[PDB]
Amino acid sequence: LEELELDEQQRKRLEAFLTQKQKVGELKDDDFEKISELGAGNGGVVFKVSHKPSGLVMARKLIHLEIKPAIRNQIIRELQVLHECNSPYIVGFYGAFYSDGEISICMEHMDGGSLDQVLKKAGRIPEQILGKVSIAVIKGLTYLREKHKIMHRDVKPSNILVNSRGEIKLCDFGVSGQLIDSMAVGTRSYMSPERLQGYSVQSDIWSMGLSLVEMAVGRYPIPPPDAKELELMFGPMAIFELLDYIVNEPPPKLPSGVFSLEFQDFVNKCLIKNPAERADLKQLMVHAFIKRSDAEEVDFAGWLCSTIGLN
Ligand SMILES: CC(=O)N[C@H]1CC[C@H](Oc2cc(-c3ccncc3Cl)cc3[nH]nc(C)c23)CC1
Ligand SMILES: [Ca+2]
Ligand SMILES: [Ca+2]
Ligand SMILES: [Ca+2]
Known part of the structure; x- marks a missing residue:
């Protein structure tokens, strides 16, 4: 479809995101330092955080859920499909993990x-x-x-x-x-x-x-x-x-x-x-x-x- 084509600028930004994303690796809870609270919504608070190893700024949504380890690993596996959704009109996805009773979802930061x-x-x-x-x-x-x-x-x-x-x-x-x-x-x-x-x-x-x-x-x-x-x-x-x-x-x-x-x-x-x-x-x-x-x-x-x- 012609409406799914990308500009030269859009193609550049999409490649730059994936290039920076390759450097990240596996997300772990202790690798994040909170910067500010971006807002609350949909059962979890979203924080503007810094991924200390890579230095990137991300949005981290923490959803407090007490579920058996199997239930959590299924959610994390189901969220992996977001790695394949890459478009100038979809917020960039970094990863998801479980830690200390909270599901984290780390995505691209939108300063607006x-x-x-x-x-x-x-x-x-x-x-x-x-x-x-x-x-x-x-x-x-x-x-x-x-x-x-x-x-x-x-x-x-x-x-x-x-x-x-x-x-x-x-x-x-x-x-x-x-x-x-x-x-x-x-x-x-x-x-x-x-x-x-x-x-x-x-x-x-x-x-x-x-x-x-x-x-x-x-x-x-x-x-x-x-x-x-x-x-x-x-x-x-x-x-x-x-x-x-x-x-x-x-x-x-x-x-x-x-x-x-x-x-x-x-x-x-x-x-x-x-x-x-x-x-x-x-x-x-x-x-x-x-x-x-x-x-x-x-x-x-x-x-x-x-x-x-x-x-
Ligand atoms: C009523 C109201 O307006 N509530 C606001 C509260 C702050 C929130 O901000 C973000 C949320 C998510 C995000 C959404 C879904 N699942 C995981 C995540 Cl991480 C990604 C983000 N990237 N950049 C930003 C700024 C951002 C937007 C909605
Ligand atoms: Ca923590
Ligand atoms: Ca911890
Ligand atoms: Ca929802």
């Missing part, structure tokens, strides 16, 4: 944090920036589907990471069933209405469209905002009530007058409740909003650094 964290800083994210985000998520989901036959299963702003180089990558896509089972939990407020009713990449496309709306307006779009909140933005529901709303009510949408019709049509085709009518990855890759965004020269790194205060 997640888009959940960026959204809290920005308030809302502009459409041109979200065009670059849409392109990366589509290509990331396409890479996982095409080269590995893998669904993400948990697309949301907190699982989309960015950095000061202008890169946008996905992470935390389901690869180990024994890890999800042993942790039984994550939010279901981004799941498609068909998954909430009892499973395809179409579900991930719903989650992308839902995440794009939240970042565009600056709030989780369900329940829909009233006209008073709109005039304050552009000029409580329990979780079980929220999931019932997703299944039994029409999908959310962008407000009129403030976003282009191509952007509105893009999220509309992502949020069609019928997965058969909902657009797939091939159709979205050639949507008018995506083709327009790909030709737009947007300085994402410059916008990101000034928005969150990186300097």
Whole structure:
């Protein structure tokens, strides 16, 4: 597929990552010194750590799990598939190990944090920036589907990471069933209405469209905002009530007058409740909003650094 091709810069960065990764070796707990806490999420705290032997800076997620030694070795073996997932739109993976009652997952460090964290800083994210985000998520989901036959299963702003180089990558896509089972939990407020009713990449496309709306307006779009909140933005529901709303009510949408019709049509085709009518990855890759965004020269790194205060 032409959408899986890489630039010369993307190919250079991918080779540089694998070249530095070959120098690492087997990860052990005592080889890490904590630098700072990057944040909490999905049953474990993520630390910015330094791998003392190699000197690299990594993100280390520690998941406290008390399981028999066999159960742990299965999770570690199932996470080894991440070594083969190499793409400019997938967060780089270093290794996983068990130590002192905690599963560690060491990955590439993204100094921009997640888009959940960026959204809290920005308030809302502009459409041109979200065009670059849409392109990366589509290509990331396409890479996982095409080269590995893998669904993400948990697309949301907190699982989309960015950095000061202008890169946008996905992470935390389901690869180990024994890890999800042993942790039984994550939010279901981004799941498609068909998954909430009892499973395809179409579900991930719903989650992308839902995440794009939240970042565009600056709030989780369900329940829909009233006209008073709109005039304050552009000029409580329990979780079980929220999931019932997703299944039994029409999908959310962008407000009129403030976003282009191509952007509105893009999220509309992502949020069609019928997965058969909902657009797939091939159709979205050639949507008018995506083709327009790909030709737009947007300085994402410059916008990101000034928005969150990186300097
Ligand atoms: C609500 C909210 O936004 N929570 C934040 C909390 C910090 C977290 O930060 C990372 C997490 C992971 C990661 C994800 C899955 N499994 C293993 C790991 Cl290591 C890799 C990372 N690389 N670089 C960074 C900065 C980073 C992102 C989500
Ligand atoms: Ca330790
Ligand atoms: Ca130790
Ligand atoms: Ca998860």
